[PDB]
Amino acid sequence: ISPELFNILTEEITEANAEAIYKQNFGDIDPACLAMPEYLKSYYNFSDEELSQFIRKYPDNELNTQKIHLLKINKIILLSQAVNLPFLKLDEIIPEQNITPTVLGKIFLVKYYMQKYNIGTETALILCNDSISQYSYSNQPSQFDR
Amino acid sequence: LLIEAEKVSQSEIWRRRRQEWEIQRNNAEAEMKQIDAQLKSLTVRREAA
Amino acid sequence: IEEIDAEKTVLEKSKAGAKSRFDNYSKLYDEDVNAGERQALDMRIASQS
Amino acid sequence: IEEIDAEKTVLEKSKAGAKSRFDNYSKLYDEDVNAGERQALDMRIASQS
Amino acid sequence: LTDICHYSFNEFRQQVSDHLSWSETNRLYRDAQQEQKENQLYEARILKRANPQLQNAVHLGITLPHAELRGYNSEFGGRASQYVAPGSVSSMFSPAAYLTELYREARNLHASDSVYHLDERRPDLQSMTLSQQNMDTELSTLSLSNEILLKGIKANQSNLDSDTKVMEMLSTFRP
Amino acid sequence: NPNNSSNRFMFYPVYQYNGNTSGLAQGRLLFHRDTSYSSKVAAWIPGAGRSLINENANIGDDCAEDSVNKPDDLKQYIYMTDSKGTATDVSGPVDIN
Amino acid sequence: DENGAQYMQWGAYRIRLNTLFARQLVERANTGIDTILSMETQNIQEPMM
Amino acid sequence: LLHEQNFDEANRWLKYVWSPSGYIVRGQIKNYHWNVRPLLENTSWNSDPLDSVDPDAVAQHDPMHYKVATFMRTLDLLMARGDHAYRQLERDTLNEAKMWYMQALHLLGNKPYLPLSSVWNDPRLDNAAATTTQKAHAYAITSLRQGTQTPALLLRSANTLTDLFLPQINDVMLSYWNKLELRLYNLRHNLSID
Amino acid sequence: NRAASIKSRDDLYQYLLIDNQVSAEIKTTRIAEAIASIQLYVNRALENIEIHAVSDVITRQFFIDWDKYNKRYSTWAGVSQLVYYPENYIDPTMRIGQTKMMDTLLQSVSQSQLNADTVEDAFKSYLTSFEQVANLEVISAYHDNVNNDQGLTYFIGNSKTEVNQYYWRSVDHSKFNDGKFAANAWSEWHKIDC
Amino acid sequence: NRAASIKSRDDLYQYLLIDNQVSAEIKTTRIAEAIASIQLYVNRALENIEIHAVSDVITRQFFIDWDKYNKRYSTWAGVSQLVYYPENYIDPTMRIG
């Protein structure tokens, strides 16, 4: 966790600072080609199985039609690339798409319990006093069904 | 045609001979690595003594 | 205990050598005849014809 | 301890023997065909011509 | 038009009174040639696209947009998405052989037969979907064999509710 | 354009004048594309500020009509796009006869 | 034909049966294999039917 | 010549057909890029390849398969030169191996991308196995071949033509990207071929 | 049903196309099991062991090619790939329809130690053998059928040598279309020995 | 530069003729690395894959002898020694002519 990444994840974004911090975080990328997930696969460098999970899946039809939330997805993508975790979790952790550093305390707790007791990723999420997820993904049964 | 048949048969038995040479070479190299690792075992026994 | 680890290494070496022999003989077995050997059988039957 | 040194000597002897086999088969492998063998292939193809 | 899956005996039963036999077998051979002409035109169209080719232009293996223009209006993108090393979608994997073996299979016996294919055990096949999960996962064969038997017994013979009803009446059944 | 193009595919535009041999009505902007799916192609000129778009973009080559017949505006930098993962930088004009 | 061609008049059709390729191949084949397999060798023309 | 491990003579024999670097005849670089003339101009010299099952017949009906075959021969030559370099473990020959595999990869380009998001719904078996789909399919292909109807866009016959299967790309050709990528991955770290 | 004669469990296996006596250790997929069911049904239908096979569908093209091509998955995949991708099966060593010219060339290069000049001399010998049949002259011919549009035609070849090695070839008139014989309508020259 | 189309790191490798993804375990000299850079450039120039190859220099005698003699170090050293020291390669067993 570099300090610059901590400034990216720390800051709060209204509609006022929106295009300013957009141009700060993207330069001159237009929101239209940023909206389509193929340039997301090209830029953010993911698998398309991984790209099933970001906004949603996407055929050439319009699906999970956003207006704009490009900064909120940027924080969670960069965080997941840092801490190496799937996206049911970072949906599940603070579903209000916001970051306060006690969320970073939580994620240090779960990463430390994983290393300490050598358990699964759902299992230390139980230890963060969070409920059992029933949502299924990755063509696999959920925490509940397993 | 019989002359050409004898020529190609002689070339083929040369190739099979060369393949047997290569199998013998690989067995020799494997035994050599085996004996080096057994030397490491023996010097460990020497330290124990 | 260090000695017994060195013995595991010498069995790794012998295992690798036997594995190389097995794969090489399996290759020369399943590739049963060459191209030129079948050409020799072709030249003989051409002479018969 | 004197015994264990004599055992290091017997592994030196086996190592030298396997090394000689390895070098000799590698030599006869890389020198794949002789001059006279290629002369035999030359005489056959001269007869074909 | 459809005269190759509908053979000259198929056409002969429809064509006892229609026309003369030497004209019929000429129609048979002409549409049998027409089927191969379909395969030639459609294939020599579609394999020009195949994406390991068109990234390297040093081949100069070139497409023509002219006849390419039409089938996307006709077949609606049947050339558009070519597919990866095989899965449940491909034209060369297991469900393709499976489908082209079904529609040759389902007319071997007449539908009034007890030995007829959809009648003899299998209304379940025409209900079955073709997903990637049906391709991939491995269940026990004996589990599916118990399942298809429960289906057939629960279906008509006793008109039961669930499997526990079946187990009750199997606890009943002596003889 | 590294910004708005995910693919490695380009448009190849050649602008046709009106007049001389093929007596046309207005100018038209030809282009070639290799993305085979039909779309619209917005040839937007930053300098003049007007765009030339052709709905139902044909496969490969296509005929796209320029509305205003003024070819000096087509001399500067041209931004063609798909709005579907393809954009192409167009510059360096050459007039030929 | 006078110039060296032969053809079968199949009604209104003329279809060529032989060629003078081996005649005019000799000049190209003088200097080596590279000249034989050129595009220039492939464009040798044949007279009118 | 390739099977007898004699490499540069095999390369100069492949250059009589398909030179990627272009041909030079008496000082002048020529325009053309293939050396066989009916490869430049596709000429089907066998009308009925589907008389029987023959790769030669289908190759004769369309010479672009001969182009692809020659291309795979060239790639086999380059990978063989790289592999025979790579087993002799001195350093400059490892650099030689790196430039041969890179020479192959810039012939190929990228690994090709396919959108995994597809049109394929998962249909019923009986719906997808409809003979109406087949009859409309055959009639549509003949209709495109004859040149008679107006193209239209309506999902009525496309209800039949949706459940057609999609074609897949060449698996044997797909093997080369993985194979060269893995060889070159072992080059980029300090591993062996094994 | 009482119409279906079923005594034992194996009779039930034959009637339901799926096995009940397999121990539950065996794992399979769904689609492969349905394939096995359908293949077992088709095998029982072709033998006329299950009674009253309808002869109308048995005569179709698919079931003539059942026993060789359509019975397994692998042969069906082989035929389907050999249509769209022949270059996986194009092998320049063995070509169907090969003259003896290429045969004696291949025999000339069929050894281990290959030098370039040996290849050159073999190529010159092949070139002479090509020269011999490129100069062929037609003495006379004979048409098969009563009228010129159908049937075959046999030619008789002359060389430009002394005591002659007369050659003959055949050509069909049925494969004629559009002002030109397609190249498969011709045949190879054959040698006459008497 | 935006003129040089560079998407990924391999594109950067092709543009700079030197590798960034090699792990630091590998040891080489300086001159051999510059040789590898120049050879990779010449290979990309002969294929006409990098655009606008000037045909004036390609027709020179050196690049006609590129593919056989000049592409590696070893064949170049063989030709250069076979000029000045033929007696290393004179063998009375096999004589041409």
Q: How many residues does chain D have?
A: 49
Contact H169 E52 (CB under 8 A): yes
**H128 and H163 Cβ atoms separated by less than 8 Å:** yes
Mutation target among I112, I124, I126, I129 for the D interface, most CBs of D within 10 A: I112
Please tell me if residue B41 touches chain D, with a CB cutoff of 8 Å: no
> Residue A12 — left, alpha, or beta (φ > 0 → left; ψ -120 to 50 → alpha)?
beta
What lies within 8 Å, CB to CB, of I70 at 6+ separation is: E101, I62, I63, I76
**Angstroms from F1 CA to nearest CA on chain J:** 8
Facing H106 at nearest CB: one of J36, J44, J72: J44
Q: Which residue of D has its CA nearest to B40?
A: D8
Query: Which of H23, H25, H37 lies closest to G42 in CB terms?
Result: H37
* HEC per residue, chain F: CCCCCCCCCCCCCEEECCCCCCCCCCCEEEEECCCCCCCCEEEECCCCCCEEEECCCCCCEEEEECCCCCHHHHCCCEEEECCCCCEEEECCCCCCC
Spell out the residues 6+ positions from residue H117 whose beta carbon is closer than 8 angstroms to its own: A48, A57, A58, A59, A60
Helices (H), chain G: 21-28, 33-36, 39-42
CA distance to partner chain G, nearest, from residue I142 (Å): 12
D29/B21 Cβ within 8 A: yes
Å from H117 to nearest chain A CA?
5
What are chain E's partners, defined as 3 or more CB pairs within 8 angstroms? F, H, I
Q: Which of I28, I59, I81 sits opposite E7 (nearest CB)?
A: I59
Q: Which two tokens stand for residue E162?
A: 């669930």
The answer, yes or no, to whether H and J have at least 3 beta-carbon pairs within 8 Å is yes
Contacts of F3 in chain A (CB under 8 A): 27-30, 33
DSSP string, I88-153: GT--SSS-TT--HHHHHHHHHT-SSS--HHHHHHHHHHHHHHHHHHHT-EEEEEEE-SSSTTSSEE
* Interchain pair J7, F2: CB under 8 A: yes
Closest CA relative to residue I122, chosen from I104, I98, I140, I135: I104
Cα separation, J54 vs J39, in Å, equals: 17
Note whether E68 contacts F: Cβ–Cβ < 8 A.
yes
Cβ A98 vs Cβ A12: under 8 Å: yes
d(CA A43, CA A45): 5
Tally the C-alpha atoms within 13 A of residue F62's C-alpha that lie toward its C-beta.
29
Q: Do J2 and F8 touch (CB under 8 A)?
A: no
For residue H50, the 8-state DSSP code is: G
A11 in contact with H, Cβ within 8 Å: no
Cα D42 from Cα J94, distance rounded (Å) = 12
Instruction: Give me E44's structure tokens.
Output: 């020599």
Nearest CB to I113; choose among D33, D48, D49: D33
- Across the interface, whether the CB atoms of E134 and I30 are under 8 A apart is answered yes
Q: What ranges make up the beta strands (E) of chain H? A: 24-25, 28-29
Q: What is the DSSP string of A64-107?
A: S--S---HHHHHHHHHHHHHT--HHHHHHS-SSS---HHHHHHH
β-strands F28-32, F14-16 pairing: antiparallel
Contact E101 I31 (CB under 8 A): no
Residue E9 burial by Cβ neighbours in a 10 Å radius (0-12, 13-18, 19+): middle
Residue of chain B whose alpha carbon sits nearest to that of D21:
B28
Task: Look at residues E7, F9, B47 and name the one whose alpha carbon lies nearest to residue I63.
Answer: E7
| Half-sphere exposure at residue H135, Cβ-oriented, CA atoms within 13 angstroms | 9
Which of I126, I127, I160 best tests the G interface by mutation, with the highest count of G CBs <10 A? I127
Amino acid (one-letter) located at I190: H
SS3 label, residue I171: strand
Residues of C in Cβ contact (< 8 Å) with I93: 35
Residues F40 and F56: beta-carbon distance below 8 Å: yes
Contact (CB, 8 A) for I182 and H46: yes
What does I45-79 look like in DSSP terms, one character per residue?
A: HHTT-SS---HHHHTSHHHHTIIIIISSHHHHHHH
Q: Which of H156, I18, I27, I80 is nearest to E99 (CA)?
A: I80
Q: Which residue of D has its CA nearest to B41?
A: D8
> Please, what's the largest Cα pairwise distance for chain A?
46
Note every long-range contact of H133-139, with CB atoms under 8 Å and residues 24 or more positions apart, other chains counting. H133/H160, H133/H161, H133/H163, H133/H164, H134/E2, H134/E5, H134/E103, H135/E1, H135/E2, H136/H160, H136/H161, H137/H161, H137/H164, H138/E1, H138/E2, H138/E35, H138/E38, H139/E1, H139/E2
Please name which of A18, A6, A92, A10 lies closest in space to residue A53, comparing C-alpha atoms. A92
Q: What CA–CA distance (Å, rounded) separates H101 from H108?
A: 11
Put simply, the answer to whether I131 touches G6 (Cβ < 8 Å) is: no
Per CB-CB distance under 8 Å, the chain G contacts of I138 are 6, 17-18
Contact with chain F for residue E11, Cβ under 8 A: no
Mutate to test the interface with E, among I62, I74, I88, I174 (most CBs of E within 10 A): I62
Q: Is F60 on the interface with E (CB under 8 A)?
A: yes
H37 and G40: CB-CB below 8 Å? Answer: no
- Token pair, residue J69, equals 């003699």
Distance from CA of J52 to the nearest CA of F (A): 15
What's the CA dihedral at B23, B24, B28, B29 to 10 degrees?
A: -30
The verdict on E121 touching H (C-beta cutoff 8 Å) is no
The J-side interface with F (CB below 8 A) comprises: 2, 5-7
D44 CB neighbours in chain B (<8 A) are 3-4, 6-7, 10
Residue I107: how many CB atoms within 10 A of its CB?
23
